[PDB]
Amino acid sequence: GSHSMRYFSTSVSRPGRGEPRFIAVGYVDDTQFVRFDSDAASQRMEPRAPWIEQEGPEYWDEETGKVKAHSQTDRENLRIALRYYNQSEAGSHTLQMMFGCDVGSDGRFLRGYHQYAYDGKDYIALKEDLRSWTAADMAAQITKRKWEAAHVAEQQRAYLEGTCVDGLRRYLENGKETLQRTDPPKTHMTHHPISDHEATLRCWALGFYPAEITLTWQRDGEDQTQDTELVETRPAGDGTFQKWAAVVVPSGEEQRYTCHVQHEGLPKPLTLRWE
Amino acid sequence: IQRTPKIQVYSRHPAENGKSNFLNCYVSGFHPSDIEVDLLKNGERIEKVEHSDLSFSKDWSFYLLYYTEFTPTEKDEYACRVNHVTLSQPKIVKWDRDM
Amino acid sequence: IYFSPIRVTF
Ligand SMILES: [Mg+2]
């Protein structure tokens, strides 16, 4: 029963139109708890979940300070990648970052992240051992080189194995009621005729937490993947997820097919038959 | 270089004609992040359409959820109109209570 | 808990 904390940062340049907008969001497993936006009136880290509001006012001052510092670094990081890649002064570019950690059911350190992507492709990344970096290309190698000399991994190793896991532990403790909960999927089945020759059999999973789900069709107890339409897990908007798997079935063959749901709120995988 | 959004128009709770719900338009796998999402009622733009804060997944691709309240009726029609640099023109996806 | 400043650029 693992748990994770992640921070997703984006810095999108807009040349001639002021400084780049920086957004940052924090997530504890599939729930968002924080937000910061450089293009916002407040200019502060703001809560996005009930349980983070129980943090003292000093938290909000320190968090605002830390996110503000990174935003500044990322605007110069955008200007450096631009000269590194011999790219024109014209044109919008994106620098994204992901950092955070993974913990055990007991709270032990499992894994730690700290990585960037420039214009949607990997730039630099801290390796699993947290001592070394992966440089995607040549520009990133210049950074690899700069960061090795500057003991950046050493510092992030301490953040990742220390601050991160501890901070996660208290978010899990404070956010017990909503995070440690497991919402089972409410299943149902729909049937829509394509023609008098065939029909679509849709099978839904609604209101579930976390987003890890598995939906699989079977024709006569043998796994189907030939004519299966499987949409991406989508948020319902209330902090729960939705998913469905459709299948093309000839008229009358509907009783040969079964939908199979695997969720960590389900003791045994639910089987679904029409009707 | 760039990726196209994968659009999904659906509701929070199952649709029932006459009950208040939430109309959702989830967009993902796109690049860059600048995207224009509009929720429509009978082809007209709904005003005061809230959206999630810009996030991405482990594979660096963005995702957003635009949403508003709505009371479904057999009479009225819903859809979301999406714009991105990867589309020569706005993409319209109608709302089917069945998908 | 956001990471403390890294005062090292690209
Ligand atoms: Mg647990």
Author numbering:
A (entry chain A): 1 to 275
B (entry chain B): 1 to 99
C (entry chain C): 1 to 10
Reproduce passages from the article.
We observed robust comparable mouse and human responses to the overlapping IBV NP164–173 and NP165–173 peptides. To determine this possibility, we solved the structures of the overlapping B/NP164–173 and B/NP165–173 peptides in complex with HLA-A24 at a resolution of 2.75 and 1.51 Å, respectively. The B/NP164–173 and B/NP165–173 peptides adopted a canonical extended conformation in the cleft of HLA-A24 molecule. The substitution of P2-Tyr (NP164–173) for P2-Phe (NP165–173) occurred without major structural rearrangement, as both residues were large aromatic residues filling the B pocket. However, the additional residue changed the secondary anchor residue at P3 from a small P3-Ser (NP165–173) to a large P3-Phe (NP164–173). The larger P3-Phe might stabilize the B pocket of the HLA-A24 better than the small P3-Ser, and therefore could explain the 7 °C higher Tm observed for the NP164–173 than the NP165–173 in complex with HLA-A24, which could also reflect the immunogenicity of this peptide. The largest structural difference between the two peptides was observed at the center of the peptide (P6/7-Arg) with a maximum displacement of 3.9 Å for the Cα atom. Thus, the structures of HLA-A24 presenting the two NP peptides showed that, despite being overlapping peptides that differ only by one residue, the NP164–173 and NP165–173 peptides adopt different structural conformations. As a result, both peptides exposed different residues to the solvent, and hence would most likely be recognized by different TCRαβ repertoires. In the case of B/NP164/165–173, responses to both peptides are equivalently immunodominant in HLA-A24+ individuals, providing breadth to the overall CD8+ T-cell response.
HLA-A*24:02 allele, highly prevalent in Indigenous populations, is associated with influenza-induced mortality, although the basis for this association is unclear. Here, we define CD8+ T-cell immune landscapes against IAV and IBV, restricted by the mortality-associated HLA-A24 allomorph. We identify immunodominant protective CD8+ T-cell epitopes, one towards IAV and six towards IBV, with A24/PB2550–558-specific CD8+ T cells being cross-reactive between IAV and IBV. Consistent with the HLA-A24 peptide-binding motif generated by NetMHC4.037,38 motif viewer, enrichment of Tyr/Phe at P2 and Phe/Leu/Ile at P9 were observed.
